[PDB]
From a paper:
Here, we present two crystal structures of GH73 enzymes from [name], including glucosaminidase B (SagB) and the glucosaminidase part of major [name] (AtlA-gl). SagB crystallized with two and AtlA-gl with one molecule per asymmetric unit. In contrast to the crystal structure of AtlE and related N-acetylglucosaminidases, which were all observed in the closed form, these two proteins crystallized in the open form. Hence, for AtlA-gl and SagB to cleave a single glycan strand, both of their domains have to slide together into a closed conformation as observed in the AtlE structure.
Numbering used by the authors: 1 to 231
The structure:
């Protein structure tokens, strides 16, 4: 209703910040066609980074949405969206709960739950059964039994429960270390070339697309934004 946007003027310049990306040892990629990367040129990075262009686009501005800020989306609105999503069908309540506890945007938490469980169909989320809607301890030895093992250990015997305990894990490493918007996660304006999430120059733009997609399904729009400014 009343978007609240904060603008941080580095006083720097897009020309400076983009060439800085080009000197990184972990060189940037460009999926000109899906499934294949190539290093991006100065224009490729300067365009993908140009917040002036990303702020004007309704799907692209979501990279500036603050992920560390819960929005009070109605729990009913959430279930209308979680409907039919395998397990997780209900419990937007368990989700609003994980959101207010850790101070983290709700859509960021749910899309993350949706990816790890394949929209509620993952065996780990499927769960007598213990559950895991966040892939906790699942990227190492045995993703299925090792994760079932974690969930069994913390009492995630029910879906609202796997959601509460898995939630503390989301955003500590990125959203809580200051990279609170998909743009900061990609370009890191406080420390450029530092702690960046991926080489693809389109990574905040793609993720902004999927987020705004969930916002539209859900029935809401973002309210807290943060746009870096170069001049
Ligand atoms: Cl702030
Ligand atoms: Cl397994
Ligand atoms: Cl994170």
């Amino acid at each position: 209703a009343a978007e609240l946007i904060k603008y941080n003027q580095t006083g720097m310049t897009l020309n400076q910040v983009a060439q800085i990306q080009a000197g990184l040892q972990y060189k940037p990629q460009v999926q000109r066609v899906p499934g294949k990367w190539t290093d991006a040129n100065f224009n490729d990075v300067k365009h993908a980074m140009d917040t002036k262009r990303l702020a004007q686009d309704p799907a692209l501005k979501y990279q500036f949405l603050r992920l560390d800020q819960p929005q009070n989306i109605s729990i009913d609105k959430i279930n209308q969206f979680l409907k039919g999503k395998g397990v997780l069908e209900n419990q937007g309540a368990a989700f609003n709960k994980a959101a207010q506890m850790y101070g983290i945007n709700e859509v960021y938490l749910i899309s993350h739950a949706l990816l790890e469980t394949g929209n509620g169909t993952s065996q780990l989320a499927k769960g007598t059964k213990y559950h895991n809607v966040f892939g906790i301890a699942a990227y190492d030895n045995d993703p299925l039994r090792e994760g079932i093992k974690y969930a069994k250990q913390a009492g995630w015997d029910t879906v609202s429960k796997a959601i509460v305990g898995g939630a503390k894990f989301i955003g500590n490493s990125y959203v809580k270390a200051g990279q609170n918007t998909l743009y900061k996660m990609r370009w890191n304006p406080a420390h450029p070339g530092t702690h960046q999430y991926a080489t693809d120059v389109d990574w905040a733009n793609i993720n902004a697309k999927i987020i705004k997609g969930y916002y539209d399904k859900i029935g809401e729009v973002g309210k807290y934004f943060d746009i870096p400014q170069y001049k």
